[PDB]
Design a protein around this ligand. Structure first.
Ligand SMILES: CC(C)OC(=O)Nc1ccc(C2=NN(C(=O)c3ccc(Br)cc3)[C@H](c3ccccc3)C2)cc1
Length: 177
């Protein structure tokens, strides 16, 4: 069996943390159920897990900061709807893994869900924030679970998008229209 290794990250946390952070950046306070604003304990319990999120959230944030215009153009205009939001989410995701899955694309998947959350809050659709991120956890663990396991897991990604890893190659923008 498997025991002691560099693989075992909870996609649920990688998402919630990503959405919880990306949302705070836009001045949004997403209430992912668990709300404990009275425990400033930064104990070294899950330092490794934090990296997968820090390096990940930083990886996408770096690309977004460069193409903020292209993002704000599609985001600000992105027509969100709880009736076809799930359907559109798949369309954007399908493109991400349409030509194959790679650490780069995986970055768009996380950045994608973040945009929707920020766009939902604008249209007074906070409830969507929980639905969007939720679909990410399921999708990530549904299909992206195996692939990531064969791509050295988040461990490999962390090394590719580590803190020292200067601005390297980017992912093909999921041009949808
Ligand atoms: C974040 C990374 C992956 O970079 C991106 O490519 N992001 C990305 C790209 C395009 C859109 C768009 N969303 N669209 C939606 O209609 C839509 C609706 C609801 C939700 Br939830 C998400 C997207 C447009 C759309 C219009 C018509 C048909 C299908 C989709 C295209 C959104 C996000």
């Amino acid at each position: 069996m498997a025991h002691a290794g560099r693989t075992g990250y909870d996609n649920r946390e990688i998402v919630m943390k990503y959405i919880h952070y990306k949302l705070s950046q836009r001045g949004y306070e997403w209430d992912a159920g668990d709300d404990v604003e009275e425990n400033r304990t930064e104990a070294p319990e899950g330092t490794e897990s934090e990296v997968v999120h820090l390096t990940l959230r930083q990886a996408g944030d770096d690309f977004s900061r460069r193409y903020r215009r292209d993002f704000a153009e599609m985001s600000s205009q992105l027509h969100l709807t709880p009736f076809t939001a799930r359907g559109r989410f798949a369309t954007v995701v399908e493109e991400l893994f349409r030509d194959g899955v790679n650490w780069g694309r995986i970055v768009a998947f996380f950045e994608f869900g973040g945009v929707m959350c920020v766009e939902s809050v604008n249209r007074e659709m906070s409830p969507l924030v929980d639905n969007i991120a939720l679909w990410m956890t399921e999708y990530l663990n549904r299909h992206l679970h195996t692939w990531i396991q064969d791509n050295g897991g988040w461990d490999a990604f962390v090394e590719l998008y580590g803190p020292s890893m200067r601005p390297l190659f980017d992912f093909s923008w999921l041009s949808l229209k």
